[model samples]
Target: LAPNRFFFMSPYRSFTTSGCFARFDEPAVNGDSPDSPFQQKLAALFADAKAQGIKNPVMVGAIPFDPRQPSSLYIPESWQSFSRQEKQASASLNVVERQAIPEQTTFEQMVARAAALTATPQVDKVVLSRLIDITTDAAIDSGVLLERLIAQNPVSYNFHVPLADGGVLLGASPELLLRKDGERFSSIPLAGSARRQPDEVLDREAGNRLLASEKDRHEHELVTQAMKEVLRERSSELHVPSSPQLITTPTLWHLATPFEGKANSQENALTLACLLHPTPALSGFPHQAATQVIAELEPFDRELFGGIVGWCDSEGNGEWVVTIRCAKLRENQVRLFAGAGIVPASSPLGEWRETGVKLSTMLNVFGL
Candidate 1:
């Protein structure tokens, strides 16, 4: 990988980055080469799972370009605005029966089990409530970005969809939630949020308030700790900048922490990073417990929604972004999943509102 010529990616599948974007004419593999590393690396992930005694590991592969129109549809104009009447009606319903597994225990109980695990030293747990069963027809067009990549001559090109709306514009993201190349490692853990305002003064104030919020700080730390612990085991030296700073993207402001570390070996960077996927910023702290709760409480299996989605090279030069800002495709439907942190101090209504705002992030990107 060329320094400063890396990939930009997100969980959402919109926004084309590089001029080099080209539809895969065939499987990514083209007669294995010393330079093409993903083939062997993917094989190893499977082998390691078996060696670790993991059975029934599901192997998910990306679908090829079929040129067919999207089966699912999400039109922002069609979204129903939330009203008091609607909120109350939704709340009044008995937990509707769905395909999601039922919870036999509470969040507290599951956290205890995670704390009790022997692997606790090697792995930290964070809760992830992934909702699935979505159908959307947001076009998966990265060819435009491929054009950009070609112009920029970057090492790799990547993008993901966390939001999309029917035919408007789909949520497009080009970000690196986390990356590791050689012995150097890095991640941008984003939390705390504020809607943009036309007034610059208000925007600055919103950013300052978001940075100072205790809730936002706590959420960010959970992610920092998770990564620190994993990196600590893999590196002899590490550094985390003092406090998180406010970083603004095109649509939102976030309190973000940029972390860096030195790896023990060339391959250890990616190996160590894979262990740190789905941080608290995306998944709640006490991850396994939260995931268990999600499996029970959510209405679907979440497939790739909350899972990791990125491309890696054979030489350990790949990026994995949290499968956030995403949707699922099944037959003729598109199910979108969005969630927010639910700390004890969190307001249920406030949480729902946060998710609403989060949903808008995707909708606006969908260009619809």
Candidate 2:
């Protein structure tokens, strides 16, 4: 197994999963097609695993936000190796400059366009995003960044996956897109957000206000309802709360609803993810319309921003989290992404500020 590889740490340090490209059996997949060939590739990986007498083989990788784009997924040569080591000192980053793509005016304009689209009745919401490019004097160490992310966002699903092009996709995501444990499945959809305050009392008030806000509640419900509808078909029984609860990270407070159900034994986590991904939380209500609006409005390619990232075993049991609060990292450049869900009630300025708050999760990580 290669030393440099994939590292994933579950929230609250629940568990850690890592993998490397030990076998280059198949060519890297890439393209802009509606259907994903990942399932077939996964089946092949597991078949190889069985041939090698490796049980419980797990495949690790990231899926792009646009299913049409290519994704990387594979089984590592060494699937059951584990190492426990003492904690090391934290490393710091030196940022030479930070620039926002499209700038503020363009983002505000996009928000305005999204808000107006929602007014058309057909489109209830559209998620708009922006990018921030951070230039460092030297190549940023992804391992150190992962360590810092884990230290700061203890309640998030932290991951560091090597990209096919020698880059790495890493982030601390608060949204659980899908998790399958045999016949049981679960998802936590987070929408409507409020920035957290440093003052303890003010932070509490912010969370309470987020829960009470009519606009926020509406936005959160759209996602919750969509997730329930998608999962209901595959599920024999499902449980979704009538109201969303407040889930907070270091930088923001979000309206989150937990969904749990028993899926048909035939379904797997990856399959469930494909069905539920780009939910209203990431895309928008009336998925097709929202996607068209997003395509026309956003200036940058989402790549894996709103996609699902995680690992799935041969048994189809695995966890996948929405790819938010993340950055695409190359040598000395890091492009951070953040987006806001815009409804008819969303104001241009408000949406812009929300994206800014979302960007803070990664901005702070770079000490920018």
Candidate 3:
């Protein structure tokens, strides 16, 4: 790794770039929408780098869940790319204590509030999150954690990005917010979920039940429709299935709808990512209203957790994945975050358990 590095990995395409040639930390978007200024800055950055003899510079980093918040995007001084088949170079964590911000009860109450809001016709669904702070006896290595995550879920969107505060954002996400290559665009958004059972038969039953559940299907349709609305405006030959497919990770199963379309080649991936961001799955349907509810409820800053992480370049090619199943790891502390979609039919205990199962994705990697 160079003095500074940024990486994003997935089953199909992945990259590890080192050294920052130029960084853009400005607020990416004015409100809950696209960040034209940040987009302009990137265009200029690429133009300037190309003029200085660097070729095909790629901008890599993350956008917080709230586009209005600051972003951590930059152009790398050097680059290397990877596919699942390629080799990537590669922790023991003893947790001294674990603290849940809105204790289970508090989180449940928060979910109840969000659910109450959903009961009103004005709101469709709201995603409320809870975070855990774990203090370890020693500093947890980012590389070790990255290796473990990669080993555990080879097909997931695994990433390691060094933050400005000396901390690292590490995750293996199962959701792809958006990926653009030339005029081809694709996204796999995961919404409703269920915990996977250790028994194969029981696991299969769980998935089937999730598929048959009215509440889960309603929750998923809201997210899928929200994504389609965004893509419909800017894409052609759009393909969205009539129903979502069930996708499985080791610990959980999610209802996912895969969307593909032909976008304008001139539109870059990062911009397109911003356009579809804070998906109903991660934020909520009726975007602005749900986010307002999330702010008034979730006690901590989402930072980059509910955000998107990946890379985009001058050639209009990139892959951006929703930053779920992630943790913020500093010297000796780890902050793991998780959230569940709440609708009028959502039960506090069920939603709380959903988040608990999701949070374990990273904890198991930490040897907790």
Candidate 4:
């Protein structure tokens, strides 16, 4: 990685440094262990750095959509906090061509098929995703994109991971996968969505309508229950409200439910993250079957898209966010990804609109 080029920022925390001191991306081993082999790999990375008199080693990187796959995590030589004032999208870049991966007609047809699968008693929901390729006349600047995303969406989780393959993953995510602080653990899953209106009164009405939507509540409920099941097994005293609350980003409105509890185990942030990686919001109900459908339908490998990204320290305290409303930059090409959750009641036109708004969350910042 380049010097002083790495970055990850939330409301209260950020890391921007240089050089890869050490790294790990091994598959988990299983023999006779209650602790995950993934967690074992992380612990050793931290301990080995301390042996060499490294001050405090923090593991920061992104994990792929399938948690079973290996991650791109490591310790940087300098862990300095680089701060900057928020900025807007620059107009200097010009786009030469824009193309959709499967095109809209194919995306709608696939959504129809996935909805029919959800009609069965076996599957409750499924998430279908699409990618767009934007080739700029000149190379896309990482610093410019990061600053615009932060300025446009101030309340979201902002992060940028420089890949070993000479690419950068950066965006502002509205969903929190998990957060660990001392003995407490918390997560907020925002599943259902609606595009915002420019008029103030119209926007308020749209959010209010979403809160009372039976369709949205059902979709949001499936995601919330899945989160609860995972947390219930790992927590000592967990609390989840019966109904969801309405929340918003600059582009969309979402149905959100908060989850909190005290942990009963000694596992750190990364370990707990594995258990809840692809919740119903990203995947779907009956995790195995839904993921099977996703693998069969999607044309591209999701890689780090729709995955998890954040940092975990040696002290067992950290934060992570879902990898959505983001893009991957490699050379002159920029690829943006977005997904729509499908159910029995979903229509092709409605889902098409949903994914469109989400994709705009990044496209607008690119001055497209």
lDDT of 4: 0.81
lDDT of 2: 0.78
Which tens-of-lDDT digit does each residue in 259-286 have in candidate 1? 7777665453235434565566655567
Candidate that scores best on TM-score: 3
Residues 167-236 of candidate 4: C-alpha lDDT, one tens digit per residue: 8898889898888887887888888887789999899999988997888889999998888887887788
Stretches of candidate 2 exceeding 4 Å from the true structure: 1-3, 11-38, 53-55, 79-97
Distance from true location, Cα of 65 in model 4, Å:
0.2
Estimate, for each residue in 110-167, the C-alpha lDDT of model 3 and write its tens digit. 9898899999988899999999999989866787777788887777888888787778
Q: How many backbone clashes does candidate 1 have?
A: 54
Clash count per candidate: 54, 2, 0, 0
* Highest-lDDT candidate: 3
Scored by CA lDDT, what does every candidate get? Answer: 0.44, 0.78, 0.84, 0.81
RMSD of each: 14.1, 3.7, 2.2, 2.7
Residue 311 of model 3: what lDDT?
85
Error of 2 at 347 (Å): 1.5
For model 1, the local distance difference test gives: 0.44
Of candidates 3 and 1, the better by TM-score: 3
Q: How does candidate 2 fare on TM-score?
A: 0.90
Runs with alpha carbons beyond 4 Å of true place in candidate 4: 1-4, 28-34, 82-91
